[PDB]
Design an enzyme around this catalytic site. Sequence first.
Site, PDB file in Angstrom:
ATOM      1  N   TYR A   2     -66.384  86.610 106.464  1.00 53.11           N
ATOM      2  CA  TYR A   2     -65.681  85.484 105.863  1.00 53.11           C
ATOM      3  C   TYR A   2     -66.245  85.164 104.483  1.00 53.11           C
ATOM      4  O   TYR A   2     -65.521  84.690 103.601  1.00 53.11           O
ATOM      5  CB  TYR A   2     -65.750  84.253 106.773  1.00 53.11           C
ATOM      6  CG  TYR A   2     -67.133  83.926 107.308  1.00 53.11           C
ATOM      7  CD1 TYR A   2     -67.996  83.101 106.594  1.00 53.11           C
ATOM      8  CD2 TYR A   2     -67.568  84.427 108.531  1.00 53.11           C
ATOM      9  CE1 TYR A   2     -69.258  82.795 107.078  1.00 53.11           C
ATOM     10  CE2 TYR A   2     -68.826  84.126 109.024  1.00 53.11           C
ATOM     11  CZ  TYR A   2     -69.665  83.308 108.293  1.00 53.11           C
ATOM     12  OH  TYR A   2     -70.917  83.006 108.778  1.00 53.11           O
TER      13      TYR A   2
ATOM     14  N   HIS B 165     -70.155  84.133 102.186  1.00 49.26           N
ATOM     15  CA  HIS B 165     -71.565  83.765 102.141  1.00 49.26           C
ATOM     16  C   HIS B 165     -71.706  82.276 102.428  1.00 49.26           C
ATOM     17  O   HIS B 165     -70.852  81.482 102.024  1.00 49.26           O
ATOM     18  CB  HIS B 165     -72.180  84.085 100.778  1.00 49.26           C
ATOM     19  CG  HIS B 165     -71.645  85.328 100.142  1.00 49.26           C
ATOM     20  ND1 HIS B 165     -70.572  85.316  99.279  1.00 49.26           N
ATOM     21  CD2 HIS B 165     -72.040  86.620 100.233  1.00 49.26           C
ATOM     22  CE1 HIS B 165     -70.326  86.547  98.867  1.00 49.26           C
ATOM     23  NE2 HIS B 165     -71.201  87.358  99.434  1.00 49.26           N
ATOM     24  N   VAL B 166     -72.779  81.907 103.120  1.00 46.43           N
ATOM     25  CA  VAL B 166     -73.087  80.515 103.424  1.00 46.43           C
ATOM     26  C   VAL B 166     -74.389  80.151 102.723  1.00 46.43           C
ATOM     27  O   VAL B 166     -75.415  80.811 102.923  1.00 46.43           O
ATOM     28  CB  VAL B 166     -73.188  80.276 104.940  1.00 46.43           C
ATOM     29  CG1 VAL B 166     -73.559  78.829 105.227  1.00 46.43           C
ATOM     30  CG2 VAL B 166     -71.878  80.640 105.623  1.00 46.43           C
TER      31      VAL B 166
ATOM     32  N   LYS C  93     -69.667  77.343 101.595  1.00 45.48           N
ATOM     33  CA  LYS C  93     -69.067  78.634 101.903  1.00 45.48           C
ATOM     34  C   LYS C  93     -68.256  79.137 100.715  1.00 45.48           C
ATOM     35  O   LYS C  93     -67.423  78.407 100.170  1.00 45.48           O
ATOM     36  CB  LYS C  93     -68.170  78.540 103.144  1.00 45.48           C
ATOM     37  CG  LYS C  93     -67.289  79.762 103.364  1.00 45.48           C
ATOM     38  CD  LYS C  93     -66.536  79.694 104.679  1.00 45.48           C
ATOM     39  CE  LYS C  93     -65.624  80.904 104.837  1.00 45.48           C
ATOM     40  NZ  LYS C  93     -64.869  80.879 106.118  1.00 45.48           N
TER      41      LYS C  93
ATOM     42  N   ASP D 101     -59.698  82.990 117.628  1.00 40.21           N
ATOM     43  CA  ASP D 101     -61.031  83.557 117.431  1.00 40.21           C
ATOM     44  C   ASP D 101     -62.030  82.612 118.088  1.00 40.21           C
ATOM     45  O   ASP D 101     -62.219  81.489 117.611  1.00 40.21           O
ATOM     46  CB  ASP D 101     -61.331  83.732 115.944  1.00 40.21           C
ATOM     47  CG  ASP D 101     -62.597  84.533 115.685  1.00 40.21           C
ATOM     48  OD1 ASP D 101     -63.158  85.100 116.650  1.00 40.21           O
ATOM     49  OD2 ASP D 101     -63.030  84.601 114.517  1.00 40.21           O
TER      50      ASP D 101
END
Lengths: 262, 235, 488, 129, 313, 67
Positions: free
Chosen positions: E32, E34-35, E46, E135
Amino acid sequence: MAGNFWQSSHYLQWILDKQDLLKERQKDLKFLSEEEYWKLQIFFTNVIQALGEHLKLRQQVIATATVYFKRFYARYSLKSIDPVLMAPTCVFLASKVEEFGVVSNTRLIAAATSVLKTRFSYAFPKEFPYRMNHILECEFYLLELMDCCLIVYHPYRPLLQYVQDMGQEDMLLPLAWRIVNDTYRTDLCLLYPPFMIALACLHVACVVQQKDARQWFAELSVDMEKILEIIRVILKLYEQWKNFDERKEMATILSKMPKPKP
Amino acid sequence: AFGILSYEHRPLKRPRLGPPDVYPQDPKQKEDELTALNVKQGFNNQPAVSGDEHGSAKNVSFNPAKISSNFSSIIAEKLRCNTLPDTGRRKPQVNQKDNFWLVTARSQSAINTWFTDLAGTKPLTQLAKKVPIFSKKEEVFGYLAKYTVPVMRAAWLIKMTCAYYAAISETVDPFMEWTQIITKYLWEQLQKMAEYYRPLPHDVEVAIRQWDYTEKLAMFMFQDGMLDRHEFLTW
Amino acid sequence: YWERLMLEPYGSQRDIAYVVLCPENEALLNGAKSFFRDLTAIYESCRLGQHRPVSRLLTDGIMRVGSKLKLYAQVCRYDLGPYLATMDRDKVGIPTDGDSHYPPAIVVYIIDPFTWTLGLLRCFLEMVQTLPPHIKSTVSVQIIPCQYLLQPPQHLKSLAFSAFTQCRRPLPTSTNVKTLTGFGPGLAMETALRSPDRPECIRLYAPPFILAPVKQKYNVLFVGYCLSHDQRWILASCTDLYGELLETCIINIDVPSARKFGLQKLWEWCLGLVQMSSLPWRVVIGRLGRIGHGELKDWSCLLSRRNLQSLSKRLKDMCRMCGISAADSPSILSACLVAMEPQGSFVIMPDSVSQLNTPQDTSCTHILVFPTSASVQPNILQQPLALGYFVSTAKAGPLPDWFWSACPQAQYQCPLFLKASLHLHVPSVQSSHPLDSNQTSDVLRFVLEQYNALSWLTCDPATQDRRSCLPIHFVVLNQLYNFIMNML
Amino acid sequence: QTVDPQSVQKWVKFSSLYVNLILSESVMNLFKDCNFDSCCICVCNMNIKGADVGVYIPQEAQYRCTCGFSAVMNRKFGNNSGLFLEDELDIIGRNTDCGKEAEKRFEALRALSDDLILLLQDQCTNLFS
Amino acid sequence: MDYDFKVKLSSERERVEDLFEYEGCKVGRGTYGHVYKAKRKDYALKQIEGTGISMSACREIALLRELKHPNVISLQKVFLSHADRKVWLLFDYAEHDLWHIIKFHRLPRGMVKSLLYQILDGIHYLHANWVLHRDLKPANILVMGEGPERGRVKIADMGFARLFNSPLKPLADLDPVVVTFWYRAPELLLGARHYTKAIDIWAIGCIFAELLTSEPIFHCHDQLDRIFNVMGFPADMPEHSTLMCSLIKYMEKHKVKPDSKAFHLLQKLLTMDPIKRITSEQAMQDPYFLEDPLPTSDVFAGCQIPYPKREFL
Amino acid sequence: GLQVSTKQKISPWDLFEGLKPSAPLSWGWFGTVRVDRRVARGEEQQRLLLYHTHLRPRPRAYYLEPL
Ligand SMILES: [Zn+2]
Ligand SMILES: [Zn+2]
């Protein structure tokens, strides 16, 4: 989000009162009268409806993009960005959010440049000189100014719920659908929640077909005085369409538009 | 957003419909059924209007004088619909099978719950569906003084007791016969603190806690015009 | 039959938390806790919300204290200041709804052992200053005598509806949009609400009952004014056509010219209420006293045809949409003045006849009006423009002494005779309504039955009928005139 | 009426032809219309004196005062009713008698914080006192 | 479209790099994006992979503008930088991922009683608003730790979430694979094109059995053999013929009692047919939660946290 | 229009809140009309005021001043 209208962002924010849109349209009214602005909003709705018809789209994406067209021009000037570029970019966003499918880049020009020179060549004698780089910055800008409000409720779901409750479906639904398709020309969707527009639609269509809907409408408890100006807008809507034609006038209106500077 | 009206807790067409634009999860909807064909070819979405759904007819003629005349008739008959029509005078009636219990002493703990809620702050509409009626009419005064219920909530229980007794005895003037039980219950109170002062005992304070409330019960009973004045002041 | 029919008022059941101020007398202590628990019952048996005390447990919401008023005031100030400044067994069978989408009213109750008593009110001057603004913005004070607890019904419901009226719920300042976008229409109304030219503490008023509507959009105000015992203070009060607003004011004029400024100062307050609305208005001025020779010179000169047109051009400047739409501009469409005074000449008795007799159980009102032309044959016309009589079976409350100094022998008759006249009658400023007609008889017979209508809003629910005659704006003016009579 | 006060007072402790000819011209000669009792300053010549009052009340030339104003009757209402003190002295007269008596009555009638007076007008704003 | 409009928007805009120290200290990385951990000059920031707005990015912003719940993650502000044309997101910081508890334990029964409750009420609210997550992973379940609220887990990473109010196209036409193969339903593994809301009921029951045994029940046709391994072969929808008792023993080797209320809830959670599978609201009517100790608002219930802080990458 | 006609006498033993509708009381005695819900007219004026930004009202202590 669906199934709860009264906690939606459209109801909390985008329901704008009558005095708000009149103040915000004054800078657009500095060059053109109210009749010329309303006929221009009639025509550019018809362009968006023509583009949605050409792409073999559904009706739900056409109404949502027309609301997206009306939301931006309710609270911003006409001379900010060209309305000829509003019509393709709002249709793409409406088809994207409803998960109908993303149109192709060359397809959208083929959707646009066919339509503006087969039924609107009198309005635009020139070509449509816009590409994806103009669209991609605009829709990225448009969602920035939409307050991230991408979910739009529509009066069709109450309208099917009203006719299935009432019982007469075959002789009412085609008459009910053409009214709601026509009421998107006006600004009633930015003023009121949609299920009074569907109720005013069911009131008009039974009177047109001379159907006794007395006992169905009297029993239900909602305000009938706010239905009355909705009825009043619709009867003014069709009355102006008797003495309005497309090919004759807008050689003057589109010549008198304030065009954005490069 | 205070200026806008919310129909969220005001349902439209309470018999046949629910909330106006709230769509609840119907467990018999098309999105949950699975035939053999629906799995393979996907969801079947057909246009609600056969033919051209996108086409809108604006060349159809309209008669706004007809519409406004018919709309004026619709709003007018709702005023005849919302009228709450007049009815004749009748005695209030009850359904005996569900409004109460026939036997009170079946459970002492249930009585302690109900009189505590009677002494509580819950309005009496919820308490109206289940009320106590004793073996005789004398225990209602002693038990209410034990919980020190307010008199307005105490007087409503008195209005229950005579209504049910009139229904069973239909198969009598309520003023003096209720007054007689009030007076004789207060007559026996004076037997306590008179002769037990002359030779503090706890049994005296038993009489004080029930005389004081019932006396204040009786004066609010008096100002209501609720009982007969003449025989009570005679006592 | 309010609690019998269990009806719901306007205002949507405001809840009240309360503090009780009581001395250390034991017999006096026990009468209050029986009174307020019964006051909790009558406020909650009727559909007005919750009468629960402060949530912390302090001897069931009652605090104690301790000539002796200084002892009563130190613990009033040193204590009430900072005070006002994982197992879930039954929560498993039901699920949580979600985050989804009003603080309770605080009214302190004070008992008076004294049978000048402003020293109990000196606490409220100390509590208003030593609190944060969120607490102090909605604080009401309630005073009751101590003799209600000991010696006596109708008292309990009357005190309940008065406190529910005096809650005066403020307009919310936070709108909780949570737009999470740099700019948009949601931020636009949010930014315009926190602009410094908006006032603070609106304190919206909703009575338990308002006048029902009678079949463009407009609104008519009723304002009444009279002087105090001295000439130092002019006291005014204003109401709506339907009585949905109840506001009053105090204006001081003290001299060791002098009267033009006091009449001028009343009017921007009157112009203050209309400009906090945004629809055109119709103004009717009532005077509880008699209009003299010199008041009307000010009332005609600055409230003329030209000047109301002059402020119409001025109001279009700072507000843009007042320029476009006249229906959203809060201007004034017509102006009228009505003087109110008794007649004291005629008497009618109800006992003489020629299924129900009127005066023992109900009240009625009868009107006769006439143009009162001077003969049968500049800015100000004839002194009576038109006159009408106001007779009423309903009795009146305590009137001022100067009201009945004309003919005091007509005070004690039950069918009461009144004399009302017209003095300005300025129609159609912006250029049919009854006020817009140039016929002088019609403008009487519009305002007077609404004057009868606002008299019916004075019905105390503990009383079978209205507690007095006259409109409520005249009564509330007398309710503060008698208060300034006794206390100062 | 008498009884109620005593009750609570209990509860406190344990808890000549020419003479009558002239008098007819100014005393009984003033019989005016009672529909004009709510009268005000004259419209004809814009004065607090008009019509034929000038021979009944003690110059200026008022010319054909055709309105119904009479300053004699008007004065009675003016003396003790709720009126402006500037206007009250005009109806009486500062130069003549009893203007000093009305001034003395007002001054003897009189003989504190701003937020406390505002508090007084909040409690009497409601319906029930 | 002119220059004065752009400088007006740039003046009204604010920069994420001028308000947050999102640079460095990258605490989470995935497909998804990078955090990053950052605060005002704690929060979870994010950045979405890809220049411009994408299919997942449109699905992210269209839903959580209007959704709000204690058991669902909530965004506070979006950022749109035109220098690189990518979308920046700001959530509140979530300390403990459910993957961290599982990895640390590879166990009191009180928290997994409440972790089962807190996910199931949230997924019923998510079904109530007519949208599917599509999900459910242990990496998607994040726990507050020693913050303003204790317990009160939040569900995030709804990049595959789609409305199902009215499908104008079949759902498998725009997404052949909707979830990872460790928690793929056998129903959509049979090539089902129009699939109902019973998919998430399969996914929670898989990760609940993962929490029951502290081991992945489904581990790597590659998983269809594993589905037939733990359930046996179902002898009682398309390409059925081309595929060419076990539940009790598999729970027995993982020291789980077969005669228990957890097992009865577990066996009713996983079926081959979606109609006989229960949906969200009937799961919480099971007295398994009522039995003995009951679900708490704080899942820790005063116990200190042995799990460490999420390490920066 | 709306006049007064009659008077009915009822014992106080019948007036109780146990039964949900009015059994001893007739709604046609009062001319009771059920009308639908609407917002307060003062409340919508506050929302409508937000766009004008008119002249500043007085702070209510300006009036209590010496001349
Ligand atoms: Zn304005
Ligand atoms: Zn004259």
